[PDB]
């Protein structure tokens, strides 16, 4: 009725702070893993060159 309640009440602030920091860390890790992937596609000049060769030019 007296002791354990008081010590729990004393614990609350530090635990709240640490859990907030942990959530911020999770969000930071989520953001840090985001990279924009620039894809590379076959240049159409080679396609045009192959078209010309097929014409026997």
Partner 1 sequence: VGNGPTFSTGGECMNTCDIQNAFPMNDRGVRSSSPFQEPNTAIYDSYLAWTYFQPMDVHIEKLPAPEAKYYQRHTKKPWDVSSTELT
Partner 2 sequence: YKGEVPPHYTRKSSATIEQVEKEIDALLGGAEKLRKTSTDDQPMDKLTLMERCLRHALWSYHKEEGRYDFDQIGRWVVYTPEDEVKLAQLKREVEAKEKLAALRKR
Partner 3 sequence: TLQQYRRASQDKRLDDLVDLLERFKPVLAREAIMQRLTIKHLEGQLGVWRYMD
Q: Which residues form the interface with partner 2 (CB under 8 A)? A: 27, 30-31, 34, 36-39, 42
Residue 40: enclosing H or E segment and its boundaries?
none
Near partner 1 in 3-22, by CB under 8 A: 9-10, 12-14, 16-17
Closest to partner 3 by CB, 1 vs 41, is 41
- Phi-psi domain of 38 (left: phi exceeds 0; alpha: psi -120 through 50; beta: other): beta
1 binds, among partner 3, partner 1, partner 2, none (CB under 5 to 8 A by kind): none
């Amino acid at each position: 009725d007296i002791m354990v309640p008081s010590f729990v009440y004393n614990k609350l602030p530090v635990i709240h702070f640490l859990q907030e920091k942990r959530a911020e860390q999770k969000l930071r890790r989520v953001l840090d893993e985001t990279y924009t992937e620039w894809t590379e596609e076959l240049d159409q000049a080679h396609v045009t060159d192959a078209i010309t060769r097929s014409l026997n030019i």
